[PDB]
């Protein structure tokens, strides 16, 4: 009735703060893993050059 409730009450703030920090850490890790991917595709100039070779020009 008295002791355990008082100690739980004393615990509450630190746990709340630590859990808030943990959530912010999760969000930060989520953000840090985002990178914009740039893909390289075969230049069409080579395709045009090959077309010329097929044209036998």
């Amino acid at each position: 009735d008295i002791m355990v409730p008082s100690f739980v009450y004393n615990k509450l703030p630190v746990i709340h703060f630590l859990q808030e920090k943990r959530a912010e850490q999760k969000l930060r890790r989520v953000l840090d893993e985002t990178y914009t991917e740039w893909t390289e595709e075969l230049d069409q100039a080579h395709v045009t050059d090959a077309i010329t070779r097929s044209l036998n020009i």
């Binding site: 075969l42 080579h46 395709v47 050059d49 090959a50 070779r53 036998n56």
Partner: protein
């Protein structure tokens, strides 16, 4: 009963009609003449364009049909022919050089090109050994565009020839073409890499000599005749009839070709 397979590759209908008339009038109907696009034996191909299914493009100077200008010359011009795909598809000669620039993998194409060059090199060295020459002349176009196909051609041709024990001398396209037309007696065996410029040189030599029939060695194994003009086609038909086992008919066609090049059909 027997069959002669006519292939058309860039040949005008007049030449094909003349060839059909010549065979029909000379053969007499014993051997039928069917038309197709690919064959391995008993085949005559009409037209400058290379047919599908040929890996070697040898040509010589037949003694009977020697022009008075080129009397006594003896040189064998062998053109290496890579496998030919459909006209729409990119040819192996083009692909082997452009895919490397594009970065695409070129393993299978290299393997196919290597096999074709090895077969062509084996044919060339065999001709050189038969004629007795010690050194052959490789012909590669020195254009910057063809900086990969020629490199593989030289790497493989020299390897096979050196393994056989003969020497190789590499040269370009303009110098060899001028030498072959002006002073051909200084060249015994000349191999040509697969280009659209070497093909013209082979045709020019086959025509300047007086008109001859080129021999094509196919993948299936055999020899097929090739012509581009009235006289060349007539000689090609005469050789083909000789192969079938007709000597008198072959001689008559050869004589008709020598006398009246453009109108052999009426001449005989």
């Amino acid at each position: 009963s027997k069959q002669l397979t006519f292939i058309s590759a860039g040949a005008t209908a007049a030449v094909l009609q003349s060839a059909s008339a010549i065979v029909s009038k000379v053969a007499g109907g014993r051997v039928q003449t069917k038309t197709a696009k690919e064959a391995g034996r008993h085949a005559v191909v009409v037209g400058p364009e290379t047919p599908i299914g040929v890996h070697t493009a040898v040509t010589e100077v037949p003694k009977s049909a020697q022009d008075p200008l080129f009397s006594g010359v003896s040189t064998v011009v062998v053109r290496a022919v890579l496998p030919r795909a459909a006209p729409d598809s990119v040819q192996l000669r083009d692909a082997l050089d452009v895919y490397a620039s594009a970065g695409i993998d070129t393993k299978e194409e290299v393997r196919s090109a290597t096999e074709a060059f090895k077969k062509s090199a084996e044919v060339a060295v065999g001709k050189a050994k038969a004629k007795g020459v010690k050194r052959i002349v490789l012909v590669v176009k020195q254009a910057s565009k063809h900086n990969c196909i020629n490199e593989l051609f030289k790497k493989i041709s020299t390897e096979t020839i050196e393994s056989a024990g003969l020497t190789t001398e590499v040269v370009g396209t303009a110098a060899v073409a001028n030498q072959l037309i002006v002073n051909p007696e200084s060249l015994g065996v000349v191999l040509l890499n697969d280009v659209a410029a070497t093909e013209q040189i082979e045709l020019a030599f086959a025509g300047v000599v007086g008109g001859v029939s080129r021999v094509y060695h196919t993948v299936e194994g055999g020899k097929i005749s090739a012509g581009h003009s009235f006289k060349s086609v007539a000689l090609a038909v005469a050789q083909e009839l000789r192969e079938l086992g007709l000597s008198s008919e072959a001689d008559k066609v050869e004589a008709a070709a020598s006398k009246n090049p453009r109108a052999v059909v009426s001449a005989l």
